[PDB]
Amino acid sequence: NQICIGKAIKPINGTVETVSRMAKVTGMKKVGGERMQKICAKGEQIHDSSSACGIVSHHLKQEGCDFPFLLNKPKFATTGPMNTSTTGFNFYLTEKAKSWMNITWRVLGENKDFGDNLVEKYGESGATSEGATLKNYYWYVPTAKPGPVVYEKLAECTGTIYYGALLSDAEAGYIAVTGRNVTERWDVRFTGSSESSISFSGPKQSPMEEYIIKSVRSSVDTVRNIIILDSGRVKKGETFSISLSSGAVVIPTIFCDGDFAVTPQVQIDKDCASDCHSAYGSFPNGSSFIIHHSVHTVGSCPPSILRNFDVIDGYEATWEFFTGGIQGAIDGWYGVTNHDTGKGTAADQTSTQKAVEAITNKLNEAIENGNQRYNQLYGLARTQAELLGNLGKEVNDLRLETFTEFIRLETILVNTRIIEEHQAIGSKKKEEVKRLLGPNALDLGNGCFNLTHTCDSNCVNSISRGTYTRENYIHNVTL
Amino acid sequence: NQICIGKAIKPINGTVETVSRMAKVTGMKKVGGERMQKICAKGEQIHDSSSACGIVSHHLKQEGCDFPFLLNKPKFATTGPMNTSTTGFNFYLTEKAKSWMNITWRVLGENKDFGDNLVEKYGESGATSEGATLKNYYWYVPTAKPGPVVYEKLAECTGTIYYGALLSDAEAGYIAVTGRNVTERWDVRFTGSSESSISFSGPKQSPMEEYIIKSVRSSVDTVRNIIILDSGRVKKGETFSISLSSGAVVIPTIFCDGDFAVTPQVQIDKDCASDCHSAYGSFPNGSSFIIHHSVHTVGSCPPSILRNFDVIDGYEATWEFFTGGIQGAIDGWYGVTNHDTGKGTAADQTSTQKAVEAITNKLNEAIENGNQRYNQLYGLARTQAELLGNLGKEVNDLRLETFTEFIRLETILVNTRIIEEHQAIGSKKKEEVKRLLGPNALDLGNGCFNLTHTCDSNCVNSISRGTYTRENYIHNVTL
Amino acid sequence: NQICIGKAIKPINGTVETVSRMAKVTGMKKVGGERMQKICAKGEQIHDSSSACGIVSHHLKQEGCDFPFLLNKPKFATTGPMNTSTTGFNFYLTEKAKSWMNITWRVLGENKDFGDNLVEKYGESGATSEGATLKNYYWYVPTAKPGPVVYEKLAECTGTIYYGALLSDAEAGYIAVTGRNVTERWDVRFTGSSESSISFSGPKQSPMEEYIIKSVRSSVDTVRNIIILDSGRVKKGETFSISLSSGAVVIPTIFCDGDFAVTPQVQIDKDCASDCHSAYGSFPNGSSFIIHHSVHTVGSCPPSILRNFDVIDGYEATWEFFTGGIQGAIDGWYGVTNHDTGKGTAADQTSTQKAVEAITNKLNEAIENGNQRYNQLYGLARTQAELLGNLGKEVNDLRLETFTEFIRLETILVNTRIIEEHQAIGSKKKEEVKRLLGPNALDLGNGCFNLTHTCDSNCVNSISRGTYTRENYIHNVTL
Ligand SMILES: *[C@@H]1O[C@H](CO)[C@@H](O[C@@H]2O[C@H](CO)[C@@H](O[C@@H]3O[C@H](CO[C@@H]4O[C@H](CO)[C@@H](O)[C@H](O[C@@H]5O[C@H](CO)[C@@H](O)[C@H](O)[C@@H]5O[C@@H]5O[C@H](CO)[C@@H](O)[C@H](O)[C@@H]5O)[C@@H]4O)[C@@H](O)[C@H](O)[C@@H]3O)[C@H](O)[C@H]2NC(C)=O)[C@H](O)[C@H]1NC(C)=O
Ligand SMILES: *[C@@H]1O[C@H](CO)[C@@H](O[C@@H]2O[C@H](CO)[C@@H](O[C@@H]3O[C@H](CO[C@@H]4O[C@H](CO)[C@@H](O)[C@H](O[C@@H]5O[C@H](CO)[C@@H](O)[C@H](O)[C@@H]5O[C@@H]5O[C@H](CO)[C@@H](O)[C@H](O)[C@@H]5O)[C@@H]4O)[C@@H](O)[C@H](O)[C@@H]3O)[C@H](O)[C@H]2NC(C)=O)[C@H](O)[C@H]1NC(C)=O
Ligand SMILES: *[C@@H]1O[C@H](CO)[C@@H](O[C@@H]2O[C@H](CO)[C@@H](O[C@@H]3O[C@H](CO[C@@H]4O[C@H](CO)[C@@H](O)[C@H](O[C@@H]5O[C@H](CO)[C@@H](O)[C@H](O)[C@@H]5O[C@@H]5O[C@H](CO)[C@@H](O)[C@H](O)[C@@H]5O)[C@@H]4O)[C@@H](O)[C@H](O)[C@@H]3O)[C@H](O)[C@H]2NC(C)=O)[C@H](O)[C@H]1NC(C)=O
Ligand SMILES: *[C@@H]1O[C@H](CO)[C@@H](O[C@@H]2O[C@H](CO)[C@@H](O)[C@H](O)[C@H]2NC(C)=O)[C@H](O)[C@H]1NC(C)=O
Ligand SMILES: *[C@@H]1O[C@H](CO)[C@@H](O[C@@H]2O[C@H](CO)[C@@H](O)[C@H](O)[C@H]2NC(C)=O)[C@H](O)[C@H]1NC(C)=O
Ligand SMILES: *[C@@H]1O[C@H](CO)[C@@H](O[C@@H]2O[C@H](CO)[C@@H](O)[C@H](O)[C@H]2NC(C)=O)[C@H](O)[C@H]1NC(C)=O
Ligand SMILES: *[C@@H]1O[C@H](CO)[C@@H](O)[C@H](O)[C@H]1NC(C)=O
Ligand SMILES: *[C@@H]1O[C@H](CO)[C@@H](O)[C@H](O)[C@H]1NC(C)=O
Ligand SMILES: *[C@@H]1O[C@H](CO)[C@@H](O)[C@H](O)[C@H]1NC(C)=O
Ligand SMILES: *[C@@H]1O[C@H](CO)[C@@H](O)[C@H](O)[C@H]1NC(C)=O
Ligand SMILES: *[C@@H]1O[C@H](CO)[C@@H](O)[C@H](O)[C@H]1NC(C)=O
Ligand SMILES: *[C@@H]1O[C@H](CO)[C@@H](O)[C@H](O)[C@H]1NC(C)=O
Ligand SMILES: *[C@@H]1O[C@H](CO)[C@@H](O)[C@H](O)[C@H]1NC(C)=O
Ligand SMILES: *[C@@H]1O[C@H](CO)[C@@H](O)[C@H](O)[C@H]1NC(C)=O
Ligand SMILES: *[C@@H]1O[C@H](CO)[C@@H](O)[C@H](O)[C@H]1NC(C)=O
Ligand SMILES: *[C@@H]1O[C@H](CO)[C@@H](O)[C@H](O)[C@H]1NC(C)=O
Ligand SMILES: *[C@@H]1O[C@H](CO)[C@@H](O)[C@H](O)[C@H]1NC(C)=O
Ligand SMILES: *[C@@H]1O[C@H](CO)[C@@H](O)[C@H](O)[C@H]1NC(C)=O
């Protein structure tokens, strides 16, 4: 009779966006992983000290609040609000210092201490009874007040250093500590990776009179000392300098950058594990991309995008006579038939395997391209700590928008390449079948062939594995 | 004889840019509208007070200059330059104050007042005879100078607040108002969405000695008071704080964000209305995009681009013996003929209607994609006032360049999609013709068919609406 | 017998990336030129004064160190480090001043002077015996100290101006020069294209006690004068103002922007010349692009990218029976044969010339598009001096990354268009030859033609130039 080849007919699932048109496909999936309901924290420590500690207490190493100086830092951390009351000095913080201490208290790296070098360079630190509990600060009060000096040091990592002043309230104490007249404004400057400065004066003179008002009172009500702080940034190789006068204070620790913990905001659930956790839930295992609005995450995490996109999973539906599809039911994607169902139709696994492998290879190449673009766009030697510190209070990252646009443009190319590869596979298969059939077999040109003899179902399935031979079918002539 | 189908031959208009090649088409149009010569301002109010007022006068609510406190603010406003002299105090403005006063005096929104709360918190304002004309300012002069305080308030909108000081020139007045020593430098700080500060000292002392020199003298020459102003930004939800001392002044009005009026620079023409207006001319009704160098506009306006692009409007000219075209004249785009002109050639409205629908749909999809990209790139909850304020003195916007590049890329995809859709329509039509014609008719493969019988002009017309029947044409045999 | 046409078979060289697939081509090249080992500086003079001069000495016009005031400024310059010791005053520079002096000492433009205007406005400059060697500065010491003034001037070019103070160490000298009390802080402010300021106070008072410590001591150890400098920026059309008090100093020279010299870091070799020189080597003549990590170069230099990409140079290898190629060896790309080698195979130069011209035209269009995009992305009126000054200490330019991505995307389109044009040329050639042979010749559809008669080597050879005629080959009939 006649024989035809084509694709198995399956119900249409959806539509994908090719470069030149929209293609109807029998199966599609989503490239990026989706956030889940809870946080999977099986087999991991949770640090919760929000009942006794504060943001500044960890920095200043108050008793019982020593997260930055721990040994095995937990991945999840939580503590009191920024305006908590400590048991030592009253404190005031610059906006930059606030934005940087929201982050630096929970870095998971190793913090370098240089208080000793200061001790041998400038003698013993200042001593006061109001800071008995607190144990991490150097107070520069030389005998020859004020005696300005410049402290030079080659940094050991890339981090943040907190510097400023520690001054009392009464004029007598201020004069006795600084040795300067009350009507004098004096500066403390920091020159590392960037230049920063802060100004001070007497208690009843600007701008310290606002430092008293805006200060955060301590737990004990009989302390007159206020510590005013500001932040400066260093570099691993470069040398940083601090301009120190009498009364100046500095927290002797370089809070090295790196990955920093997250503060849970949703339900914490045990008995389940994951690999990429966020502040609002974890993510499924082995995701190529992540639906997230930031680069802050813990564990092994792929690049983040803002919205999902659809990629192909089956094949194009090029059918509704013979239109290209096969009415029979077969176990595969491509097949050959003689308009008979049940025994006269067979499927070939080679084309299906080639199509699946092509889909997988195209997806892998696209993922590699996206990863390379992400690395170029953020930098190979990046760090979440500095990436969020430099952002500040801004919650919109335009680089994420650029990355999302790049992924959106890449998905269309993926679909186009997959469809073109499928078309090439089909053309090669039909040309091979035509060559195998021989030159005495008429070709319809639409994928069907019309033999000069009768071709039963054995005639059909013989072609399936390519063992068909012309000799056994020479008998009889028909058109 | 024989029958053929194809497209009507029309003169070639030009070339458009497809992804893979350049396509010669019989018609194109431009995606974006063009600025017109004049401004169409029919049925809209125009404000012009450049002969009596100035930028600062509107802020300070001078008698006869109260644009920000109006009820129905006109969309076109004009006033005197920045350095115009008011009838009240001599004034000095920081560069930020100038850059923000260029905008905030002509906002079309509603401004919020908080002078009352200041009155109850810190008593009555200071009194001076030199500011009788002015009516919008609060002068903080407590009984016990200096008496520093901090003013906290939760804002109601997103805008700018102008603060600073108001001090005399003589040393006696400065000492009487401020209560500070002349050899003292004090500060006024603003802490809202961002940190700002301003410094003052004695009249014969830096930095005020330059404040007198750079001040703008008033109309009356017997005033010794200078008001020094600076700008700060607030946020709708968060709380802003100002550090006040004796002598500090603040303008109690939050100039809320929103659209702001344009200052016409071309001829204003009545008797004609429009929808989108610019400072250099109006724009046509219902434009998909605007050829503009900035995002400042009034009325309903689409996204702005920097240069025009060509989109397809006809169809590709795939012809110069039959090449694909039809030499005869028909009312449409596609047609069928038997190499006869006038009565043997017939046209079908279905294919032309489908092509027009395809063009419209592709253009609509492109416009939607461009709008979505514009929204992503600027932000859904944006505001022209803050967008132009943050630019400052910069006249080049890189985001407009990015959007223009995106639109230039999108137009090529639009042309490719339209051409592919036209090709698909043509292929489907010729397949339908071949199946309707029958299996006894030879197919040339180039769109022509060669029948076994003679096919006159009535035969050609029969196929046109599909009522062709093979019975009445059985007679005679020809090849 | 039969005749076939196709492409000459050549070994596969490489693979290029098309929009929808990966293409195998017989020849490819690289879009951008590559840096070489040395610097080809034949016929160019080199300035080297690293043993006597310093960065600041060139600005201050020390004897024997006058690069900024030359007439024929060399393209290659080298001098001592920033912290060298001059023979006059001790000097201190701000971070901005350091970053801008790293550049402005070697600009190749013409620098504008305005010292005469200052002299005729405010009298003669201050006189000190410690700066006899130095010759480029204006010291402001009015008779009636302090006597603050504001200096207004309309700038002549776009450049940088260095301003600050020149103050002694002893209290008596400071009081005599400035005329102020020691416990006073006074500011010098600059308002041009931007705002800048610097502060000064007594010697035993902040922030000058740190200026003394951080200063660079001069060669002579008996000097007490320290010059503290800072940088401000001006615009060609606008007016800049400086707030001058007694004791302030300004370097009266606008260092106009433009191309600035490069400091060699590799071996300098004469006896060889090039067109574009970088700081680490020259580049090949007539390069379309440059593999460079910055926009700093001397001479005529094309736009810079970060990595090379591959573009097609031959043609696609669409073959492994006849598959499309020609087994014979011919001098060209396209040819016609009758399965005979040596005399039955001939090639046509028309198709080869058309293909080469298409490749050249596509590359030229791509280069034009890239240059235009570079112009939009940096600006038509750009300047290397300001483009590198605004960067500061940042070594990564995101704009270069964006341009590299744009070039990478453009290369794919170039390959696609070239392949499409080659396919169109082949289709036109085969259609033309099929038309030439006539309607009595059988068409295989794969590019091979099968004649009713025998077609010897002379027959196939005559077809190449199109002089084939039917009359002399009618003899004999064969299928
Ligand atoms: C110390 O630093 C911390 C981080 O460095 C600071 O943490 C930030 O705190 C903010 C306030 O507490 C917080 O902002 C809130 O975010 C919440 C997010 O939860 C929402 O969940 C919804 C579903 O239920 C989402 O619809 C919603 O937005 C979506 O986000 C998806 C990704 O998760 C996107 O794919 C979607 O497009 C969608 O829209 C996005 O919204 C983003 C804004 O949230 C926007 O930037 C983005 O462009 C998309 O448009 C969201 O996921 C909200 O419910 C709250 O209303 C509020 O916005 C920040 O998220 C915290 N940052 C991080 C990294 O967690 C901490 O405040 C600071 N401490 C101090 C004292 O300053
Ligand atoms: C308070 O704020 C106001 C707005 O926030 C400030 O208004 C700005 O004032 C500037 C100074 O007066 C003004 O700059 C001038 O702009 C004029 C524009 O008119 C030109 O018309 C030409 C045709 O006749 C055009 O060729 C020209 O440029 C074109 O613009 C097209 C759009 O119409 C673009 O598509 C084209 O690409 C082309 O090139 C653009 O040029 C832009 C610069 O003008 C450039 O930024 C852009 O990237 C393109 O390259 C232009 O349209 C010029 O004639 C003058 O020479 C001068 O440049 C600003 O345009 C005003 N801004 C707005 C939004 O109106 C106001 O100054 C401020 N107050 C104070 C005191 O500062
Ligand atoms: C006054 O101003 C001057 C300029 O205005 C300042 O000059 C800069 O000084 C820096 C410090 O010395 C200097 O940084 C060094 O650069 C060297 C470059 O040599 C390398 O050679 C390698 C091969 O041997 C390359 O692999 C290497 O990087 C490559 O660069 C290619 C371009 O040619 C890229 O295509 C490649 O991708 C590759 O990687 C790049 O690296 C870049 C950083 O180097 C990076 O920005 C880029 O994104 C790519 O990732 C490089 O070519 C290094 O050997 C040194 O280790 C150091 O990095 C700057 O290059 C100088 N700038 C210029 C324009 O010359 C001067 O410091 C300043 N003075 C003061 C006192 O501040
Ligand atoms: C997701 O991946 C995590 C890996 O981090 C899986 O957790 C581990 O699963 C293996 C196999 O059961 C266990 O042997 C490990 O003990 C698990 N890790 C921990 C820390 O408990 C997790 O099972 C995966 N989940 C899914 C659904 O695949
Ligand atoms: C452009 O659109 C504007 C709408 O803003 C048209 O102005 C209105 O036109 C209608 C119809 O004639 C009138 O009923 C309204 O009174 C008009 N509004 C005003 C304020 O006058 C305008 O006619 C349109 N112009 C063109 C050429 O289409
Ligand atoms: C690269 O281009 C430079 C252009 O400056 C060539 O240098 C010139 O070459 C011409 C041709 O011989 C000479 O007449 C000039 O005298 C050369 N200029 C100088 C300053 O020497 C250089 O020869 C080119 N090199 C190569 C390899 O093409
Ligand atoms: C193909 O063969 C069948 C019978 O096997 C016949 O009915 C049909 O007409 C043939 N097709 C063509 C195009 O002749
Ligand atoms: C498409 O396939 C998915 C996965 O099998 C299924 O959940 C969905 O219902 C399907 N949709 C249609 C329209 O067939
Ligand atoms: C501290 O801040 C929290 C919010 O972060 C607020 O609810 C609380 O009232 C504040 N406490 C004080 C004493 O200001
Ligand atoms: C403060 O100033 C007075 C007068 O100027 C001076 O006598 C006194 O020594 C100053 N105080 C200090 C600590 O120098
Ligand atoms: C088509 O028919 C015409 C006459 O009706 C004839 O001249 C022509 O040769 C035919 N075409 C072919 C390819 O046979
Ligand atoms: C193309 O069409 C437009 C629209 O009518 C017309 O203005 C223009 O002159 C045409 N171009 C040519 C070359 O005919
Ligand atoms: C005020 O500014 C204008 C520019 O808008 C200028 O022409 C005028 O001279 C200025 N007036 C004074 C007194 O400087
Ligand atoms: C100014 O300073 C002197 C001493 O320096 C002091 O006696 C006087 O009280 C000060 N003025 C005020 C208003 O406090
Ligand atoms: C083409 O002609 C050759 C001999 O010239 C012959 O062997 C071959 O069978 C012909 N092709 C076809 C399809 O018949
Ligand atoms: C491709 O051609 C280039 C240029 O001749 C040559 O250097 C390279 O070795 C070739 N590659 C292969 C695989 O033949
Ligand atoms: C000057 O700077 C160089 C590096 O530029 C450094 O090696 C040298 O030690 C410095 N000299 C002094 C005295 O600090
Ligand atoms: C310094 O201050 C004293 C008292 O405050 C004053 O008498 C003297 O005039 C001041 N110095 C100058 C140069 O004015």
Side-chain angles (χ1 to χ4, degrees), chain B residues 53-71:
Chain B
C53 303
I55 289 172
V56 174
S57 314
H58 293 289
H59 283 86
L60 281 163
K61 206 164 144 61
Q62 189 185 181
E63 181 66 28
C65 319
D66 56 348
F67 187 94
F69 312 99
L70 278 180
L71 196 51

Side-chain angles (χ1 to χ4, degrees), chain B residues 62-118:
Chain B
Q62 189 185 181
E63 181 66 28
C65 319
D66 56 348
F67 187 94
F69 312 99
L70 278 180
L71 196 51
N72 285 317
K73 310 204 175 69
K75 283 202 207 323
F76 306 96
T78 309
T79 193
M82 182 90 60
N83 58 342
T84 59
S85 63
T86 174
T87 53
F89 313 107
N90 304 322
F91 62 92
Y92 176 74
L93 313 163
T94 306
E95 306 298 303
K96 270 172 52 187
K98 288 190 211 158
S99 291
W100 278 107
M101 279 183 151
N102 182 43
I103 287 164
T104 48
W105 78 268
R106 54 185 161 141
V107 289
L108 307 181
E110 179 180 0
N111 298 312
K112 302 297 202 300
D113 185 0
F114 60 97
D116 307 343
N117 179 249
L118 270 163

Side-chain angles (χ1 to χ4, degrees), chain A residues 83-241:
Chain A
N83 57 342
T84 56
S85 176
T86 177
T87 51
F89 319 115
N90 304 319
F91 60 93
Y92 179 58
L93 315 159
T94 300
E95 306 302 304
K96 270 177 52 189
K98 290 191 212 159
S99 291
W100 271 106
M101 293 196 321
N102 181 38
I103 280 165
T104 45
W105 75 269
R106 55 185 155 144
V107 285
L108 311 184
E110 290 288 331
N111 297 311
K112 305 295 201 300
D113 182 359
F114 61 98
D116 307 343
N117 169 252
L118 278 163
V119 164
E120 288 87 6
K121 284 182 70 67
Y122 298 128
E124 290 293 328
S125 160
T128 176
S129 73
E130 312 187 354
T133 306
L134 279 298
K135 282 192 312 301
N136 194 48
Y137 63 97
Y138 186 87
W139 197 11
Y140 175 52
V141 286
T143 315
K145 304 175 180 67
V149 301
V150 170
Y151 176 66
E152 294 281 329
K153 183 175 173 65
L154 195 142
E156 296 167 350
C157 78
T158 304
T160 313
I161 309 188
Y162 301 104
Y163 70 100
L166 172 61
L167 308 154
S168 66
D169 269 338
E171 276 199 342
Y174 177 89
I175 290 186
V177 166
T178 80
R180 290 187 199 252
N181 261 322
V182 296
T183 71
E184 274 205 13
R185 167 180 309 202
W186 53 281
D187 291 331
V188 181
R189 314 217 177 185
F190 190 97
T191 304
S193 177
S194 311
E195 190 276 331
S196 299
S197 66
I198 187 151
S199 281
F200 306 99
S201 66
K204 310 171 161 323
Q205 293 82 17
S206 181
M208 183 177 177
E209 50 197 29
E210 88 176 9
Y211 294 169
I212 294 91
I213 300 170
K214 293 193 209 173
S215 61
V216 171
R217 318 301 308 165
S218 77
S219 299
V220 291
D221 45 353
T222 67
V223 290
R224 306 259 79 83
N225 272 280
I226 297 89
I227 175 167
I228 302 108
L229 287 180
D230 198 27
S231 81
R233 300 267 301 146
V234 310
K235 194 77 99 181
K236 178 164 172 57
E238 274 68 3
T239 293
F240 74 97
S241 87

Side-chain angles (χ1 to χ4, degrees), chain B residues 112-125 136-138 151 153 250-254:
Chain B
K112 302 297 202 300
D113 185 0
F114 60 97
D116 307 343
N117 179 249
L118 270 163
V119 162
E120 289 88 6
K121 285 182 70 67
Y122 296 129
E124 267 299 328
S125 158
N136 193 46
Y137 72 101
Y138 184 84
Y151 177 65
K153 183 175 173 66
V250 65
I251 294 183
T253 285
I254 315 179

Side-chain angles (χ1 to χ4, degrees), chain A residues 20 185 206-207 209-210 307, chain B residues 180 185 187 189 243 417:
Chain A
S20 58
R185 167 180 309 202
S206 181
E209 50 197 29
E210 88 176 9
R307 45 192 91 89
Chain B
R180 294 187 197 255
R185 168 180 303 205
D187 288 330
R189 315 215 173 186
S243 177
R417 290 181 225 139

